[PDB]
Amino acid sequence: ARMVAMRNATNNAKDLVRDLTLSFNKARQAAITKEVSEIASGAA
Amino acid sequence: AKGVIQEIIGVVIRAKFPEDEVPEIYNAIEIPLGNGDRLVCEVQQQLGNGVVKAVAMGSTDGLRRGLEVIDTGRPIAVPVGPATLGRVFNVLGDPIDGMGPIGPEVERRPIHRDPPSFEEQNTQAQIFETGIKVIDLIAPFTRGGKTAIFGGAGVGKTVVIQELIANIAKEQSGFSVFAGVGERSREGNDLIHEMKEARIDENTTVFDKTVMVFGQMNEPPGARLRVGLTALTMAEYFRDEGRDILLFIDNIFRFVQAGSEVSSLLGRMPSQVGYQPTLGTEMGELQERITSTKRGSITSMQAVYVPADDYTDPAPATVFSHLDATISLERSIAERAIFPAVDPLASTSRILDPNIVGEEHYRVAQEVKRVLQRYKDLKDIIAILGMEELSDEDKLTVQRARKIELFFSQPFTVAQQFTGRPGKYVPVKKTVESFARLLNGEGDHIPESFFYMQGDFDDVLAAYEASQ
Amino acid sequence: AKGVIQEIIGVVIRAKFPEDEVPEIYNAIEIPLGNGDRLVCEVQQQLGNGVVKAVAMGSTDGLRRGLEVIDTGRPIAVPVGPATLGRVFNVLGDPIDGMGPIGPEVERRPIHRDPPSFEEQNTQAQIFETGIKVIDLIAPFTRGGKTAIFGGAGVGKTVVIQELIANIAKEQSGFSVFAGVGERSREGNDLIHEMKEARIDENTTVFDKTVMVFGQMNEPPGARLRVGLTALTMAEYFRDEGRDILLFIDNIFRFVQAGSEVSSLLGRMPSQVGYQPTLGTEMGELQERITSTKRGSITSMQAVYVPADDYTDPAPATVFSHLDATISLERSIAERAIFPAVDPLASTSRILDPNIVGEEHYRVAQEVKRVLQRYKDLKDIIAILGMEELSDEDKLTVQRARKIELFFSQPFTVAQQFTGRPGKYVPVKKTVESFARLLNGEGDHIPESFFYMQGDFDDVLAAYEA
Amino acid sequence: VNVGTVIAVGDGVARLSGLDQVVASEIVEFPPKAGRNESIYGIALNLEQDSVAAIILGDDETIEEGDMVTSTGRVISVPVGQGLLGRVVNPLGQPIDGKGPIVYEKTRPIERIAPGVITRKSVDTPVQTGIIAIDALIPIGRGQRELIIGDRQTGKTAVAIDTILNQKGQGMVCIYVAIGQRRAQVAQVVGTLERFGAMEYTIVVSATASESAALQYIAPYAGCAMGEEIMENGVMLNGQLVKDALIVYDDLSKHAVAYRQVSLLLRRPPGREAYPGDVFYLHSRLLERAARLNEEYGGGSLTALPVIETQANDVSAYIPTNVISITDGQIYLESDLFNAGQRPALNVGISVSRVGGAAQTRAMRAVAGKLKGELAQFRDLAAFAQFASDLDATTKAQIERGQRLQELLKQPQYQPLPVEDQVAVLYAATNNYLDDVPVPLITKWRDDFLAFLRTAHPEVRKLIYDNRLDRKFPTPEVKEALEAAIKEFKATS
Amino acid sequence: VAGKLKGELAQFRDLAAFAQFASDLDATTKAQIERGQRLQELLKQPQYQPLPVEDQVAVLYAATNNYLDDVPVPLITKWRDDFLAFLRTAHPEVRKLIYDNRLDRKFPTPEVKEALEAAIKEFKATSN
Numbered sequence A: 001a002r003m004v005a006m007r008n009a010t011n012n013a014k015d016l017v018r019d020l021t022l023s024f025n026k027a028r029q030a031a032i033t034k035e036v037s038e039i040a041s042g043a044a
Numbered sequence B: 001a002k003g004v005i006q007e008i009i010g011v012v013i014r015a016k017f018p019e020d021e022v023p024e025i026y027n028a029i030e031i032p033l034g035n036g037d038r039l040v041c042e043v044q045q046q047l048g049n050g051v052v053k054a055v056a057m058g059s060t061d062g063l064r065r066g067l068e069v070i071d072t073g074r075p076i077a078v079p080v081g082p083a084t085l086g087r088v089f090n091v092l093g094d095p096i097d098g099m100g101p102i103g104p105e106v107e108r109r110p111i112h113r114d115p116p117s118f119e120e121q122n123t124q125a126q127i128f129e130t131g132i133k134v135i136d137l138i139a140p141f142t143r144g145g146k147t148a149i150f151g152g153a154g155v156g157k158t159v160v161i162q163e164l165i166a167n168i169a170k171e172q173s174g175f176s177v178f179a180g181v182g183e184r185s186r187e188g189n190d191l192i193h194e195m196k197e198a199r200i201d202e203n204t205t206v207f208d209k210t211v212m213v214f215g216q217m218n219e220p221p222g223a224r225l226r227v228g229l230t231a232l233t234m235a236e237y238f239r240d241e242g243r244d245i246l247l248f249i250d251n252i253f254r255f256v257q258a259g260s261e262v263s264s265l266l267g268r269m270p271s272q273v274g275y276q277p278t279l280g281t282e283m284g285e286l287q288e289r290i291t292s293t294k295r296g297s298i299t300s301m302q303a304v305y306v307p308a309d310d311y312t313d314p315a316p317a318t319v320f321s322h323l324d325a326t327i328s329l330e331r332s333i334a335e336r337a338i339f340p341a342v343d344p345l346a347s348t349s350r351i352l353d354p355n356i357v358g359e360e361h362y363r364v365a366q367e368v369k370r371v372l373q374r375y376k377d378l379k380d381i382i383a384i385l386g387m388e389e390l391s392d393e394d395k396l397t398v399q400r401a402r403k404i405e406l407f408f409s410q411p412f413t414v415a416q417q418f419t420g421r422p423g424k425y426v427p428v429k430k431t432v433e434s435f436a437r438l439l440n441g442e443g444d445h446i447p448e449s450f451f452y453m454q455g456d457f458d459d460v461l462a463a464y465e466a467s468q
Numbered sequence C: 001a002k003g004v005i006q007e008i009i010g011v012v013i014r015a016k017f018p019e020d021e022v023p024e025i026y027n028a029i030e031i032p033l034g035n036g037d038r039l040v041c042e043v044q045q046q047l048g049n050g051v052v053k054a055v056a057m058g059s060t061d062g063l064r065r066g067l068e069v070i071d072t073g074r075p076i077a078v079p080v081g082p083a084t085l086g087r088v089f090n091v092l093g094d095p096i097d098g099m100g101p102i103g104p105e106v107e108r109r110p111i112h113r114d115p116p117s118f119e120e121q122n123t124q125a126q127i128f129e130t131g132i133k134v135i136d137l138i139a140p141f142t143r144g145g146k147t148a149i150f151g152g153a154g155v156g157k158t159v160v161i162q163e164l165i166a167n168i169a170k171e172q173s174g175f176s177v178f179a180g181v182g183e184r185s186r187e188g189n190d191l192i193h194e195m196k197e198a199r200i201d202e203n204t205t206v207f208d209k210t211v212m213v214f215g216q217m218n219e220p221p222g223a224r225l226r227v228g229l230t231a232l233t234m235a236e237y238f239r240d241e242g243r244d245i246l247l248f249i250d251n252i253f254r255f256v257q258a259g260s261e262v263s264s265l266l267g268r269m270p271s272q273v274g275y276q277p278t279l280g281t282e283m284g285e286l287q288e289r290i291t292s293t294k295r296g297s298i299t300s301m302q303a304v305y306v307p308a309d310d311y312t313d314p315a316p317a318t319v320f321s322h323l324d325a326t327i328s329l330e331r332s333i334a335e336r337a338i339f340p341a342v343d344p345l346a347s348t349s350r351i352l353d354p355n356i357v358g359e360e361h362y363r364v365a366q367e368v369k370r371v372l373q374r375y376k377d378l379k380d381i382i383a384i385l386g387m388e389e390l391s392d393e394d395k396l397t398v399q400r401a402r403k404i405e406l407f408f409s410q411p412f413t414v415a416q417q418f419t420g421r422p423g424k425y426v427p428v429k430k431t432v433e434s435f436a437r438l439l440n441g442e443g444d445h446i447p448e449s450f451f452y453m454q455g456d457f458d459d460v461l462a463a464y465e466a
Numbered sequence D: 001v002n003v004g005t006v007i008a009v010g011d012g013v014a015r016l017s018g019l020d021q022v023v024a025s026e027i028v029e030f031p032p033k034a035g036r037n038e039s040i041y042g043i044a045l046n047l048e049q050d051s052v053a054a055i056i057l058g059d060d061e062t063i064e065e066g067d068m069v070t071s072t073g074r075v076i077s078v079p080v081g082q083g084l085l086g087r088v089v090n091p092l093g094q095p096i097d098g099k100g101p102i103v104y105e106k107t108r109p110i111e112r113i114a115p116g117v118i119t120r121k122s123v124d125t126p127v128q129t130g131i132i133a134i135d136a137l138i139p140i141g142r143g144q145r146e147l148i149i150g151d152r153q154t155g156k157t158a159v160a161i162d163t164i165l166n167q168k169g170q171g172m173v174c175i176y177v178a179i180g181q182r183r184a185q186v187a188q189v190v191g192t193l194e195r196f197g198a199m200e201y202t203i204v205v206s207a208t209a210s211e212s213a214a215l216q217y218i219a220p221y222a223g224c225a226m227g228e229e230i231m232e233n234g235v236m237l238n239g240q241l242v243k244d245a246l247i248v249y250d251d252l253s254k255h256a257v258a259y260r261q262v263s264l265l266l267r268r269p270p271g272r273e274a275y276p277g278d279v280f281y282l283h284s285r286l287l288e289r290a291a292r293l294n295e296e297y298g299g300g301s302l303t304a305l306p307v308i309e310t311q312a313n314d315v316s317a318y319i320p321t322n323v324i325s326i327t328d329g330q331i332y333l334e335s336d337l338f339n340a341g342q343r344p345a346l347n348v349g350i351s352v353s354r355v356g357g358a359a360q361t362r363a364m365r366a367v368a369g370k371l372k373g374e375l376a377q378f379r380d381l382a383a384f385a386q387f388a389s390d391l392d393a394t395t396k397a398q399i400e401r402g403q404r405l406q407e408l409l410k411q412p413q414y415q416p417l418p419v420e421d422q423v424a425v426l427y428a429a430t431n432n433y434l435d436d437v438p439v440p441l442i443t444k445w446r447d448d449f450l451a452f453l454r455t456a457h458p459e460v461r462k463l464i465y466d467n468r469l470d471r472k473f474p475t476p477e478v479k480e481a482l483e484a485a486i487k488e489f490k491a492t493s
Numbered sequence E: 001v002a003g004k005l006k007g008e009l010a011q012f013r014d015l016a017a018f019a020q021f022a023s024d025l026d027a028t029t030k031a032q033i034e035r036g037q038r039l040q041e042l043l044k045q046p047q048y049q050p051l052p053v054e055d056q057v058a059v060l061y062a063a064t065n066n067y068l069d070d071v072p073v074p075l076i077t078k079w080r081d082d083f084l085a086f087l088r089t090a091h092p093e094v095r096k097l098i099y100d101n102r103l104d105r106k107f108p109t110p111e112v113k114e115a116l117e118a119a120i121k122e123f124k125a126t127s128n
């Protein structure tokens, strides 16, 4: 039972890692966009 | 008077006037435009030797440089009074319904007025029953105060607004004003017309007690920018004479987005994500006019659209500080088929006070938040480890929290178009009693699926007995 | 013509011209370098009274303001024809190999052509038969359609490229163009030179059947931006003759990055994550001349480097918007000596639908992926408790899945001299029949071996008998 | 006074000095010169002092500094009428199919305000897409805005093309606007429309990826101008005057990208996701013109089917949420369902159509309401589906019923189903007449069943078609006839 | 007085990890987490009801010196309120004494220590 529970928990953790990776990449793209936007605004 | 257009940048028109006849900051100028119909622009800036920058509030896509502009000398004047009741207007105050134009004898008031002073502020407020369980329990709708719903694209802001209007528009005890700033002309209007004209209050329809100013998504930025001010001017007359006003503004965001487009065309230095530098001041100038004073009360219900699903966007972040009651609609709740979609933990209200709303109501609301706060604290543990690892009382609180989430769902009378569930009107007392019984333990044996799309607790019990 | 340099800011320069005869956009102005050599700059903007802003595409370190500039009156003229075959060029069309100049008799065409009109496009999509079993079954090519390959270059990507070139050369008209966009001078130029000259097919080396255009790392961003257009210009001559061309573009993301750098240098406002505002338009100028027309077809395989690991990043997103098939080379599949290390589960293709490749091809491909997907799910469980716990039939799927993934191996004619094994070209119909007959039950008694580096099922049986 | 000279050609914008008497959105001509036989047009937008910025509708390398420009005296407009029918054209109205020049009696100005609030009426007449799932759970009416939003290769274009194909005898003028699509995909769509003979009522406006960002920005507006002309004036189709049009804008995400490129090349301030601050205004003014006019204003309609491409099933992005807020209903096409084999992949749990439910044939909703209920039960019991032998008879029966319904919804491409066939199949499946049928062949069964009604009982199909407007569709005559039809077909099979 | 409060609250926050999951913790940790909950419930002050320095000092002394251990958590706040009423009615002199010598280096003066623990014990008998 512990083996099955840890298998399920590992699968859930991997799914959560995938979701968090998607969210982190979205945040990274947003941060780069914000940085370049404010740098271009300061330059102009 | 009698200037000439120099530049036409988008909907922003720069015009040169004589040196001693420059229009004021908020005056309205007019392009004859031929054909007997004229384009009414509103000055925004004064740039120098008779040059003024104005916002077209119109198509402004068929006029050339060098066209003459006539200075009216006054800001936009809209009709006010009982003559505006039961009529539909533009941003300019010109009716668009089939009925005739407003007569000259009707008073014309400028759409730009000072908000009520600090003396005139009326801080007295009381609960307004709306028949929606989550609204009347977690974030009570406030009579004489400012409230709004902040929802994403896919959530049901329009459904909630229409249900609210259907519930509270028959027993108005006063007139009402609806402003359709930046909203679909399919549902936002022309089917609120169908519902408002169908509703009858002792042989007088609800539409006969309503002033509706539109300026919707199709209009250029200027119309969406000043339609809110026009509606406020039409409602301030009724407030000043003592009549209670139900004010329903749609997508205050769309008001802010237009300001953003106007500022971008005006050449102002952009702030944050392309927004205007004068975002806070514009929001204040519009919202401080939406206040209940000592002469009359305005019961205002607003909607706010959050770009993408970002509640940290400057527009909703600016709105949040101008409200008595906040109701946050989340996409995650909506995608769970919970069509009310209100997040109890992100929805607050100032009148949720045991002196104002009642001791039992206050206790029930605080407990319904403490539960679902214990649930939000355990979302990850349930996600990874599962339900079993929690303690017994934690399991009970999580089960009750999920039951409460299902129970906040409620069918709406205006949702019959796409949902087969008949509408339900749950009084605030019934909602409080149902949630108190749910928190006590009654209904623990009931499966959670029986709390979905129900009214008070008696309906859930009856459904359970029907399922045996 | 005969302008004068007015401004030199890095690679971006400005040239003043008379009020008339101002060069158009993309007009390849030329600056004499005080000797036979010259610096070709491509005009990207027209400013005010005769001033044109251009990208250097060269060192631009020995230049002085006021130096003479000559307008060519046309975009970068790239030599085209059979003379380009077996030769290596840069973005400007100058041959960078040991051999001498191409010569004025050879036709030169503008780099900036236009994609084929709406009439010339093929109404239906035809499958391009590469001959590799895994490629032609799991992620079949599309004639005139783009294709992406994902790998770390240590998994035999060059072997697959050489095999495709050899197959098209021997079984079709067979001319290929390799665009080394952002190509390292050591890893990507001399190593590939030796590999292509050493690899031989029917007494002809692969290098003799391909045209190689290298926009190297050390070249300015404009050169790496326009090397792909140079390669398309070179391949379009062979496409116009009715031949079928394979265009191999290495790391199209480097083309995207060069475009972004050029846009940043020109002063244009940035878009999203440090990307050019003209990302979609620039990706459409490219990869739209890669189409299957009435006269001929250009099919392209393009290596794609994914920034970080984002398939939602704007550069891989814009690349994916123009892709018909993706091939995912994977390291573990290559660590075991399966050289065609195409990951069947990750690799997909648009043309793998019943209405094009046939119902039988679709049915077998799905079943091949289905058993492999079941094997991937049981990879955990087999390491969990051992193969014993697995139920029967599931035990068959694991046994069958290992055999089929070993059967994805295929001997290559370009690798004949290295491995001493003749190459086997397996047609798409033969591949479909062989894998269907593998799935239905035939060959189950055969062990996992005898499927390794084989051709059709017929080869697997004949070997088992012997 | 009507002629000017270009003083600068840059990022797709020419400055056009000295072009007085130009209105705020003319279509300047750039008359042909040596080396350019044809004329490329431009849209003047910044009518600033002593210079007129103009987007170049085409490749910007063609024109030079000092090139003569002629003002056409016309706000940006597209030719429209009946001549556009069956022709693939540029966003400028010029033909690209090569059949011949466009014959047009009049040109409609794009970029116009929508009819308005009063000049509208609630949708009543349904649009039959031909997909069981769409026509059952996501009703679409004439003059509404329904959004097809999905993740890359998931079938948005396939759904739009099936909807276009089905509108053969429905008196619709389908308009397909390809924004940013590669030329191969536009050619394949045109060929598919030609093979099924749907081009007799279809107008295709193509703005491909290779074309300038000037196009792909006015292409949806040209298509919407054509749709407005259909809606107001109407055209002659099959000998009758049709005033109902269906427009598919395809990828508006590519339209948003093109407008972002245009704005950034004009040095306009960026907003969220580097998109210009008025991209919502872009898509709203594009889509709001799709309306259902009331009787006094013509009674016409213009159904809009925008298509949005998301990344990693992120419906919370900027453009997808903008279009979701603008449109009336959404058709979420999940990639997981598409890969699982459910090719008409619809996330029916969270896909919805706010309006158009009342704009559905009474029969179709009568047989689809409890279908929706059963699918909801299947979605709820999918959690319990993992357990084996621990489920009672009711839950197992519900799971099997939901699987049967999902297999029924699975429909092959290029096979539209008439409304009578849809309602008959839904009746048979949802009134327990398909419980004995094994799941893997149900789809096959459907085809066979249709053939039965196509051969054995044409009168049953005709009677069902005539009795679709009645308040109570399951009238005794049609109910008995249909029940006899399924009983006869099951016995033979 | 507040040093023990801060230490116990920090230590309870530290053991929240074991509190969320573990149910086999020894009696020491159970009483420790219970004291942490006591102290947390002590701080659940209402609105517009400020407590002067002497009142807070008295309540914190009562809680930190184990005089509040027997009280269940949900009533603690009520307890506190009731306690204050006691000091506002039964014994104002103890509040005056606490306020008067709140600046001395050693606050728990034997004079202060008595008549306050006595007041707490008297309140304990009167209520529950």
Ligand SMILES: Nc1ncnc2c1ncn2[C@@H]1O[C@H](COP(=O)(O)OP(=O)(O)OP(=O)(O)O)[C@@H](O)[C@H]1O
Pocket: C350, C351, C353, D150, D151, D152, D153, D154, D155, D156, D157, D158, D159, D185, D343, D344, D411, D412, D413
């Ligand atoms: N119902 C269906 N049955 C079978 N195949 C389908 C079905 N719908 C779509 N497909 C196939 O799926 C693939 C992608 O569909 P489609 O051409 O509509 O693309 P899309 O998802 O709209 O987007 P994109 O234009 O970006 O490729 C095509 O090969 C098409 O034939």
Ligand SMILES: [Mg+2]
Pocket: D152, D153, D155, D156, D157, D158
């Ligand atoms: Mg598509």
